Coordinates of C-alpha atoms and ligand atoms in Angstrom, one line a residue:
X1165 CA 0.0 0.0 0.0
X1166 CA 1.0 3.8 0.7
X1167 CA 3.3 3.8 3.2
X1168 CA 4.6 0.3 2.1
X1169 CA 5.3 1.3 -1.0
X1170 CA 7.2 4.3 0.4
X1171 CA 9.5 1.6 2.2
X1172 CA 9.9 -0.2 -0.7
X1173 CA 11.2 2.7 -3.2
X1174 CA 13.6 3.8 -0.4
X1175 CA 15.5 0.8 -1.0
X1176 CA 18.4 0.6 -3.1
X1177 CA 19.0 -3.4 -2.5
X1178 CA 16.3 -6.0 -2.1
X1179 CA 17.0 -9.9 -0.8
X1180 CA 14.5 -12.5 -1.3
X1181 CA 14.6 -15.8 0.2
X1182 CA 14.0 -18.6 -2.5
X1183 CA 11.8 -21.2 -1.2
X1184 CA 8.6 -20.4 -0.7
X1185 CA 8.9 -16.9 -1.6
X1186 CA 10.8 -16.1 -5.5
X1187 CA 9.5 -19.9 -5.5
X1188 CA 6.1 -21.6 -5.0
X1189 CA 7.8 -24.9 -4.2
X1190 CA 11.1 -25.8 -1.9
X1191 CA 14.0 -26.8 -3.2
X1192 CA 15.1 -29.4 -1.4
X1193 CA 11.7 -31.0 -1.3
X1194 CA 11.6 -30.7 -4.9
X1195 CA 15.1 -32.7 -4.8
X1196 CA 13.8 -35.5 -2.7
X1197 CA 10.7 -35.4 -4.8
X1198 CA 12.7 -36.4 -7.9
X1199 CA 15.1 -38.6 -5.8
X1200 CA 12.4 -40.5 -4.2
X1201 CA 12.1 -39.2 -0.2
X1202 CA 9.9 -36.9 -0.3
X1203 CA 7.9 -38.2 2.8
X1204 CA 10.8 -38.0 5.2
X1205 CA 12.7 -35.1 3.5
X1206 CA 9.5 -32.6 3.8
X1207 CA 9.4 -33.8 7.3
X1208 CA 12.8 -32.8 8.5
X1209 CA 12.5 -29.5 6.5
X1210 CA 9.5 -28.4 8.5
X1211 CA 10.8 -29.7 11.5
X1212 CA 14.0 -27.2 10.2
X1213 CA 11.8 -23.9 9.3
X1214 CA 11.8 -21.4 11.6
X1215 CA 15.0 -20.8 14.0
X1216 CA 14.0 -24.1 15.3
X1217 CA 17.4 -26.1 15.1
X1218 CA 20.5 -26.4 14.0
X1219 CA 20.6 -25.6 10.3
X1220 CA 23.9 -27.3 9.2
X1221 CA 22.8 -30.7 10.6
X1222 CA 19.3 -30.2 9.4
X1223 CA 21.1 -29.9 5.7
X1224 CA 23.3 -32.7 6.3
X1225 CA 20.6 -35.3 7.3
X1226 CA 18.5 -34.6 4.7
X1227 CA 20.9 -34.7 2.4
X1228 CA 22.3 -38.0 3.5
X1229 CA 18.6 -39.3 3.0
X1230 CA 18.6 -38.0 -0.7
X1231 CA 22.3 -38.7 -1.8
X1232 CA 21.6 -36.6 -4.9
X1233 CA 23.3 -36.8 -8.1
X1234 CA 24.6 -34.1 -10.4
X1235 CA 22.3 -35.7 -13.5
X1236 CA 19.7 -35.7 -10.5
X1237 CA 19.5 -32.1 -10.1
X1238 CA 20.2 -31.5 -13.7
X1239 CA 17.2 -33.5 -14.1
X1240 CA 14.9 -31.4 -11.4
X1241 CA 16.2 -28.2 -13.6
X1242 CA 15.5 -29.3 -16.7
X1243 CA 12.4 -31.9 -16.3
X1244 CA 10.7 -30.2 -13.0
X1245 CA 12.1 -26.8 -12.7
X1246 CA 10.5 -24.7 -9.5
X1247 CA 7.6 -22.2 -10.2
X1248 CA 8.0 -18.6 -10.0
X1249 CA 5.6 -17.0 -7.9
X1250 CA 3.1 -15.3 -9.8
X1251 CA 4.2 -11.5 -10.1
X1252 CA 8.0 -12.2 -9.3
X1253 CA 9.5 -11.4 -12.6
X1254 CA 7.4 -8.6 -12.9
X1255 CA 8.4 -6.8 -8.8
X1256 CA 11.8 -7.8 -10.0
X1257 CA 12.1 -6.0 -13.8
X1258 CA 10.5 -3.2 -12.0
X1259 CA 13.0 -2.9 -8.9
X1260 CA 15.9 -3.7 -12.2
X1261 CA 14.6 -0.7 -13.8
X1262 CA 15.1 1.2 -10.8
X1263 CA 18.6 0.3 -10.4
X1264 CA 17.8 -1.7 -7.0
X1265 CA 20.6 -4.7 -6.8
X1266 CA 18.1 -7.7 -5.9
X1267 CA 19.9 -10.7 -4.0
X1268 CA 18.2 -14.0 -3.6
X1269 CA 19.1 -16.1 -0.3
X1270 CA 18.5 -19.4 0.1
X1271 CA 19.3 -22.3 2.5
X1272 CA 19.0 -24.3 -0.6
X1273 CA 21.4 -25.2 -3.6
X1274 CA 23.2 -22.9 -5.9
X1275 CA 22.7 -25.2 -8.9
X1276 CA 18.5 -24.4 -8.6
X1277 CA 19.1 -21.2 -7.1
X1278 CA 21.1 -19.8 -10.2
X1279 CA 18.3 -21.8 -12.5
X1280 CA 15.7 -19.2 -11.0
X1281 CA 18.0 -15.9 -11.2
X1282 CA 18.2 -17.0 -14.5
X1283 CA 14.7 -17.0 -15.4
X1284 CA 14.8 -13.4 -13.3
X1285 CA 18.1 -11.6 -14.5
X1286 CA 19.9 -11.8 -11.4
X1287 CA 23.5 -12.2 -12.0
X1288 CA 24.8 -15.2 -10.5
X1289 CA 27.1 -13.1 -8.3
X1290 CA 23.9 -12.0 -6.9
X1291 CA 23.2 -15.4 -5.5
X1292 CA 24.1 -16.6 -2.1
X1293 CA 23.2 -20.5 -1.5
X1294 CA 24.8 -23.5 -0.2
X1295 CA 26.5 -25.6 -2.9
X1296 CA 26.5 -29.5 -3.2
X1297 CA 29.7 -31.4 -4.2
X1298 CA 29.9 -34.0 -6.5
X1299 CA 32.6 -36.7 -7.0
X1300 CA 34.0 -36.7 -10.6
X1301 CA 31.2 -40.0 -11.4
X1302 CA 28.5 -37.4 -10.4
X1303 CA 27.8 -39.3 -6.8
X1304 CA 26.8 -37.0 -3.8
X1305 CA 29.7 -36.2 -2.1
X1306 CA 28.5 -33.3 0.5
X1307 CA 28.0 -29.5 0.4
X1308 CA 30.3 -26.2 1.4
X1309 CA 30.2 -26.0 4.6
X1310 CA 32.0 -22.5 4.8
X1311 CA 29.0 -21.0 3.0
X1312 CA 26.6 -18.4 5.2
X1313 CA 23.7 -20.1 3.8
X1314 CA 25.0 -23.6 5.6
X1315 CA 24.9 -21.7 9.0
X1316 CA 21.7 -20.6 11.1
X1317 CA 21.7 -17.1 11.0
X1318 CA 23.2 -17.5 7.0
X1319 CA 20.6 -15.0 5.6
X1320 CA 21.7 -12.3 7.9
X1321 CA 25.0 -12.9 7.6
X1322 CA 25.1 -12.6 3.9
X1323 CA 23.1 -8.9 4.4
X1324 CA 26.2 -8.4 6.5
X1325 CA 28.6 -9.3 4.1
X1326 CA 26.7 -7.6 1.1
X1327 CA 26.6 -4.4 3.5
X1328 CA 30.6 -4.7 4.2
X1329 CA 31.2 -5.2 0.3
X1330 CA 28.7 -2.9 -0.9
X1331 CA 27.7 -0.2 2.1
X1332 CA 24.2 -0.3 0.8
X1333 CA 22.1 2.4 2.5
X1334 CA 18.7 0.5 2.6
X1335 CA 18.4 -3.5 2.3
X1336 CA 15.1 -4.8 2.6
X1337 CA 14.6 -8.7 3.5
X1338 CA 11.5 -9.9 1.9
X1339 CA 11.0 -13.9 2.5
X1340 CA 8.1 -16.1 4.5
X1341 CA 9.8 -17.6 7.7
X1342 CA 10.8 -16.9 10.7
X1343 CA 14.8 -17.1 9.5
X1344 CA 13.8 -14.2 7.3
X1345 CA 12.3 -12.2 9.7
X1346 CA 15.2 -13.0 11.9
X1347 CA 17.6 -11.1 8.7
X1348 CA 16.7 -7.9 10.0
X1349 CA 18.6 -6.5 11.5
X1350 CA 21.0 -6.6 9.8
X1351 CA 18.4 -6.0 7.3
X1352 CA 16.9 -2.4 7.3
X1353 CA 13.3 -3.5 7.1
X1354 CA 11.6 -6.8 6.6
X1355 CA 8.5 -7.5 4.4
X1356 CA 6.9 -11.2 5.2
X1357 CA 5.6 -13.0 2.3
X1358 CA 2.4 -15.3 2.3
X1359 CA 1.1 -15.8 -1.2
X1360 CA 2.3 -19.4 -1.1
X1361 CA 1.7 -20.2 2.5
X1362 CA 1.1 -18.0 5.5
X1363 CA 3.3 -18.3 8.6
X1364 CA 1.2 -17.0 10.8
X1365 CA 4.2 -16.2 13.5
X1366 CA 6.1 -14.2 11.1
X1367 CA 2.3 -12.0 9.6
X1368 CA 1.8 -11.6 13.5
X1369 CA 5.3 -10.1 14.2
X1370 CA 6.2 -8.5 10.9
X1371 CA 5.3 -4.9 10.3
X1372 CA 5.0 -5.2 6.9
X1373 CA 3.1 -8.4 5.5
X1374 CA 2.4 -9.0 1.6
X1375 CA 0.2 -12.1 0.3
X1376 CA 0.5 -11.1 -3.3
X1377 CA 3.7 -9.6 -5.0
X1378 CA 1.4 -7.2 -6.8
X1379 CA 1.1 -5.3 -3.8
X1380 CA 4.7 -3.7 -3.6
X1381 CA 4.1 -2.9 -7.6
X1382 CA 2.7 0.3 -6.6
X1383 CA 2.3 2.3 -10.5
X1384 CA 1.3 1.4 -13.7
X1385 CA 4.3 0.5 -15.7
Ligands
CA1481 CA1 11.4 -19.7 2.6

């Protein structure tokens, strides 16, 4: 609205978390979807949302469970890429035109991640997402676990970094979850997201709350 979008054109870089959010689906669900543990993989990653537990074992047991393969997830990319969120490409062109640096944040894998800036003209540098490893066979062999994104807290640690490298005057954090919420600070401001599901912790504690990405396009361009 008004004074939303007043907080939206102040800022001069915008981060969006990935699943859920740029994305109607989650990326590692979608992985164990096309790997074959869904069940038990969607289990542990809601057990995970929220600050509820230690992220980099969280990562590492569900990926022991999926063991994916690099044809595996070149597979999900090419046969069952994610969804874009209806009215993503369009918020993002407009903040583009305007010269805002968008970010997208994810707890999930560079390799899907980097798909979807893709589809949204975000340079890869503009990514920040953990990264599976692969032995030369294409066999699972683990992720980088010096990546903020591994780490609880890795969403506000890349704002940190990005403010460091960048010395942005305004970031806003825009995702659905509690982790997001938790970006900011560092974040300047934080919008919750609930067009594909509503966390009802983070609408009740957020100050600014969107369930359709049409809200924040606030013209007629
Ligand atoms: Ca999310």
């Amino acid at each position: 609205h008004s004074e939303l979008r007043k907080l939206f054109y102040s800022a001069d870089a915008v981060c969006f978390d990935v699943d859920s959010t740029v994305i109607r689906e989650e990326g590692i669900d979608e992985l164990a979807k096309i790997c074959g543990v869904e069940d038990a993989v969607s289990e542990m990653t809601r057990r995970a949302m929220g600050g509820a537990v230690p992220f980099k074992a969280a990562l590492t047991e569900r990926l022991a469970l999926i063991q994916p393969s690099r044809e595996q997830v070149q597979r999900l990319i090419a046969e069952q890429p994610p969804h874009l969120t209806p009215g993503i490409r369009e918020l993002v062109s407009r903040l583009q035109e305007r010269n805002v640096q968008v970010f997208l944040i994810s707890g999930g894998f560079r390799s899907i991640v980097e798909h979807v800036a893709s589809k949204l003209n975000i340079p890869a540098t503009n990514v920040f997402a953990n990264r599976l490893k692969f032995y030369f066979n294409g066999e699972y062999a683990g992720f980088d676990e010096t990546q903020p994104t591994a780490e609880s807290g890795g969403k506000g640690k890349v704002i940190k970094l990005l403010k460091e490298k960048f010395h942005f005057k305004k970031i806003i954090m825009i995702g659905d979850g509690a982790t997001d919420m938790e970006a900011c600070p560092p974040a300047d401001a934080f919008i919750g997201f609930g067009g594909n599901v509503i966390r009802q912790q983070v609408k009740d504690n957020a100050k600014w709350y969107i369930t359709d990405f049409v809200e924040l396009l606030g013209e007629l361009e």
